[PDB]
């Protein structure tokens, strides 16, 4: 949850978008929702990535803040 994984506003917005979609497609597993998210992402507006953007730097800030004696 608070690790420097290769995520981003997309995997950040898509993690809820896939969760928000999986609800609608509880069978659409990763191998499929993946094209959904990445297709829901490009289907966004770029300027609408304001929140999913800072939400990345935050979860990234919550990770390092967690490891002091780095």
GROMACS .gro file of N, CA and C in nm:
model
  210
    1UNK      N    1   0.086  -0.122   0.000
    1UNK     CA    2   0.000   0.000   0.000
    1UNK      C    3   0.088   0.125   0.000
    2UNK      N    4   0.193   0.125   0.078
    2UNK     CA    5   0.283   0.243   0.082
    2UNK      C    6   0.422   0.203   0.033
    3UNK      N    7   0.431   0.146  -0.084
    3UNK     CA    8   0.564   0.104  -0.137
    3UNK      C    9   0.592   0.181  -0.266
    4UNK      N   10   0.716   0.192  -0.304
    4UNK     CA   11   0.749   0.266  -0.428
    4UNK      C   12   0.722   0.178  -0.550
    5UNK      N   13   0.604   0.122  -0.559
    5UNK     CA   14   0.571   0.035  -0.675
    5UNK      C   15   0.554   0.123  -0.800
    6UNK      N   16   0.559   0.060  -0.914
    6UNK     CA   17   0.545   0.130  -1.043
    6UNK      C   18   0.397   0.163  -1.069
    7UNK      N   19   0.341   0.251  -0.992
    7UNK     CA   20   0.200   0.290  -1.012
    7UNK      C   21   0.198   0.430  -1.071
    8UNK      N   22   0.085   0.493  -1.073
    8UNK     CA   23   0.082   0.629  -1.130
    8UNK      C   24  -0.063   0.680  -1.126
    9UNK      N   25  -0.087   0.799  -1.173
    9UNK     CA   26  -0.225   0.852  -1.170
    9UNK      C   27  -0.317   0.751  -1.235
   10UNK      N   28  -0.268   0.685  -1.335
   10UNK     CA   29  -0.350   0.585  -1.404
   10UNK      C   30  -0.371   0.464  -1.315
   11UNK      N   31  -0.266   0.398  -1.278
   11UNK     CA   32  -0.284   0.282  -1.188
   11UNK      C   33  -0.346   0.335  -1.059
   12UNK      N   34  -0.339   0.464  -1.041
   12UNK     CA   35  -0.397   0.526  -0.921
   12UNK      C   36  -0.545   0.547  -0.945
   13UNK      N   37  -0.577   0.600  -1.058
   13UNK     CA   38  -0.719   0.627  -1.091
   13UNK      C   39  -0.784   0.498  -1.138
   14UNK      N   40  -0.709   0.419  -1.208
   14UNK     CA   41  -0.760   0.291  -1.262
   14UNK      C   42  -0.779   0.190  -1.149
   15UNK      N   43  -0.707   0.203  -1.041
   15UNK     CA   44  -0.723   0.106  -0.931
   15UNK      C   45  -0.863   0.123  -0.873
   16UNK      N   46  -0.915   0.242  -0.881
   16UNK     CA   47  -1.051   0.266  -0.831
   16UNK      C   48  -1.145   0.253  -0.949
   17UNK      N   49  -1.097   0.287  -1.065
   17UNK     CA   50  -1.178   0.275  -1.187
   17UNK      C   51  -1.200   0.128  -1.217
   18UNK      N   52  -1.101   0.046  -1.191
   18UNK     CA   53  -1.119  -0.100  -1.216
   18UNK      C   54  -1.205  -0.154  -1.103
   19UNK      N   55  -1.187  -0.100  -0.986
   19UNK     CA   56  -1.269  -0.143  -0.873
   19UNK      C   57  -1.410  -0.092  -0.901
   20UNK      N   58  -1.418   0.026  -0.955
   20UNK     CA   59  -1.549   0.085  -0.989
   20UNK      C   60  -1.607   0.014  -1.110
   21UNK      N   61  -1.523  -0.051  -1.185
   21UNK     CA   62  -1.572  -0.122  -1.306
   21UNK      C   63  -1.595  -0.269  -1.269
   22UNK      N   64  -1.499  -0.328  -1.206
   22UNK     CA   65  -1.512  -0.469  -1.165
   22UNK      C   66  -1.646  -0.490  -1.098
   23UNK      N   67  -1.694  -0.389  -1.033
   23UNK     CA   68  -1.825  -0.400  -0.965
   23UNK      C   69  -1.927  -0.426  -1.073
   24UNK      N   70  -1.906  -0.359  -1.180
   24UNK     CA   71  -1.995  -0.371  -1.298
   24UNK      C   72  -1.951  -0.493  -1.379
   25UNK      N   73  -1.828  -0.533  -1.363
   25UNK     CA   74  -1.775  -0.651  -1.436
   25UNK      C   75  -1.685  -0.729  -1.341
   26UNK      N   76  -1.748  -0.796  -1.248
   26UNK     CA   77  -1.680  -0.879  -1.147
   26UNK      C   78  -1.611  -1.000  -1.211
   27UNK      N   79  -1.628  -1.018  -1.339
   27UNK     CA   80  -1.561  -1.131  -1.407
   27UNK      C   81  -1.444  -1.074  -1.487
   28UNK      N   82  -1.457  -0.950  -1.527
   28UNK     CA   83  -1.348  -0.884  -1.602
   28UNK      C   84  -1.227  -0.878  -1.512
   29UNK      N   85  -1.147  -0.978  -1.519
   29UNK     CA   86  -1.029  -0.983  -1.431
   29UNK      C   87  -0.918  -0.891  -1.485
   30UNK      N   88  -0.804  -0.892  -1.422
   30UNK     CA   89  -0.692  -0.803  -1.466
   30UNK      C   90  -0.667  -0.816  -1.617
   31UNK      N   91  -0.632  -0.933  -1.662
   31UNK     CA   92  -0.603  -0.951  -1.807
   31UNK      C   93  -0.706  -0.878  -1.895
   32UNK      N   94  -0.823  -0.850  -1.844
   32UNK     CA   95  -0.925  -0.781  -1.928
   32UNK      C   96  -0.947  -0.637  -1.880
   33UNK      N   97  -0.979  -0.619  -1.756
   33UNK     CA   98  -1.002  -0.480  -1.706
   33UNK      C   99  -0.882  -0.393  -1.743
   34UNK      N  100  -0.770  -0.455  -1.765
   34UNK     CA  101  -0.648  -0.378  -1.802
   34UNK      C  102  -0.676  -0.294  -1.926
   35UNK      N  103  -0.730  -0.353  -2.029
   35UNK     CA  104  -0.758  -0.275  -2.151
   35UNK      C  105  -0.871  -0.179  -2.120
   36UNK      N  106  -0.950  -0.211  -2.021
   36UNK     CA  107  -1.062  -0.124  -1.982
   36UNK      C  108  -1.006   0.003  -1.917
   37UNK      N  109  -0.924  -0.016  -1.818
   37UNK     CA  110  -0.864   0.100  -1.747
   37UNK      C  111  -0.782   0.183  -1.844
   38UNK      N  112  -0.684   0.122  -1.904
   38UNK     CA  113  -0.596   0.195  -1.999
   38UNK      C  114  -0.681   0.251  -2.112
   39UNK      N  115  -0.802   0.205  -2.124
   39UNK     CA  116  -0.891   0.257  -2.230
   39UNK      C  117  -0.985   0.355  -2.164
   40UNK      N  118  -0.995   0.347  -2.035
   40UNK     CA  119  -1.081   0.440  -1.961
   40UNK      C  120  -0.994   0.560  -1.930
   41UNK      N  121  -0.867   0.534  -1.918
   41UNK     CA  122  -0.769   0.640  -1.890
   41UNK      C  123  -0.755   0.732  -2.010
   42UNK      N  124  -0.718   0.677  -2.122
   42UNK     CA  125  -0.703   0.762  -2.243
   42UNK      C  126  -0.840   0.822  -2.272
   43UNK      N  127  -0.941   0.762  -2.216
   43UNK     CA  128  -1.078   0.810  -2.237
   43UNK      C  129  -1.110   0.920  -2.135
   44UNK      N  130  -1.010   0.966  -2.062
   44UNK     CA  131  -1.033   1.072  -1.962
   44UNK      C  132  -1.021   1.208  -2.031
   45UNK      N  133  -0.950   1.302  -1.974
   45UNK     CA  134  -0.939   1.435  -2.042
   45UNK      C  135  -0.802   1.498  -2.014
   46UNK      N  136  -0.712   1.425  -1.955
   46UNK     CA  137  -0.577   1.482  -1.927
   46UNK      C  138  -0.589   1.586  -1.815
   47UNK      N  139  -0.668   1.687  -1.836
   47UNK     CA  140  -0.684   1.791  -1.731
   47UNK      C  141  -0.761   1.733  -1.613
   48UNK      N  142  -0.834   1.627  -1.635
   48UNK     CA  143  -0.911   1.565  -1.524
   48UNK      C  144  -0.818   1.478  -1.440
   49UNK      N  145  -0.693   1.470  -1.478
   49UNK     CA  146  -0.596   1.386  -1.401
   49UNK      C  147  -0.538   1.468  -1.285
   50UNK      N  148  -0.598   1.579  -1.252
   50UNK     CA  149  -0.544   1.664  -1.142
   50UNK      C  150  -0.541   1.588  -1.008
   51UNK      N  151  -0.649   1.521  -0.976
   51UNK     CA  152  -0.661   1.447  -0.849
   51UNK      C  153  -0.585   1.314  -0.852
   52UNK      N  154  -0.600   1.239  -0.957
   52UNK     CA  155  -0.528   1.109  -0.964
   52UNK      C  156  -0.379   1.139  -0.974
   53UNK      N  157  -0.345   1.263  -0.998
   53UNK     CA  158  -0.201   1.297  -1.008
   53UNK      C  159  -0.144   1.319  -0.869
   54UNK      N  160  -0.200   1.409  -0.795
   54UNK     CA  161  -0.149   1.434  -0.657
   54UNK      C  162  -0.170   1.309  -0.573
   55UNK      N  163  -0.267   1.229  -0.607
   55UNK     CA  164  -0.291   1.105  -0.529
   55UNK      C  165  -0.172   1.011  -0.545
   56UNK      N  166  -0.090   1.035  -0.644
   56UNK     CA  167   0.029   0.948  -0.664
   56UNK      C  168   0.141   0.999  -0.575
   57UNK      N  169   0.169   1.125  -0.586
   57UNK     CA  170   0.276   1.184  -0.503
   57UNK      C  171   0.243   1.164  -0.355
   58UNK      N  172   0.117   1.156  -0.322
   58UNK     CA  173   0.078   1.134  -0.180
   58UNK      C  174   0.116   0.993  -0.138
   59UNK      N  175   0.059   0.895  -0.202
   59UNK     CA  176   0.092   0.754  -0.166
   59UNK      C  177   0.243   0.734  -0.174
   60UNK      N  178   0.310   0.811  -0.255
   60UNK     CA  179   0.458   0.798  -0.265
   60UNK      C  180   0.519   0.868  -0.145
   61UNK      N  181   0.454   0.971  -0.098
   61UNK     CA  182   0.504   1.045   0.020
   61UNK      C  183   0.473   0.963   0.145
   62UNK      N  184   0.364   0.891   0.144
   62UNK     CA  185   0.327   0.807   0.262
   62UNK      C  186   0.426   0.691   0.273
   63UNK      N  187   0.486   0.652   0.164
   63UNK     CA  188   0.583   0.539   0.168
   63UNK      C  189   0.713   0.584   0.236
   64UNK      N  190   0.778   0.680   0.180
   64UNK     CA  191   0.907   0.727   0.239
   64UNK      C  192   0.885   0.775   0.382
   65UNK      N  193   0.783   0.852   0.406
   65UNK     CA  194   0.758   0.901   0.543
   65UNK      C  195   0.751   0.782   0.638
   66UNK      N  196   0.718   0.669   0.584
   66UNK     CA  197   0.705   0.547   0.668
   66UNK      C  198   0.844   0.491   0.700
   67UNK      N  199   0.937   0.509   0.612
   67UNK     CA  200   1.075   0.457   0.637
   67UNK      C  201   1.169   0.574   0.668
   68UNK      N  202   1.192   0.597   0.795
   68UNK     CA  203   1.280   0.705   0.842
   68UNK      C  204   1.426   0.664   0.830
   69UNK      N  205   1.462   0.559   0.897
   69UNK     CA  206   1.603   0.510   0.894
   69UNK      C  207   1.634   0.451   0.757
   70UNK      N  208   1.611   0.525   0.653
   70UNK     CA  209   1.640   0.474   0.517
   70UNK      C  210   1.791   0.466   0.495
   0.00000   0.00000   0.00000
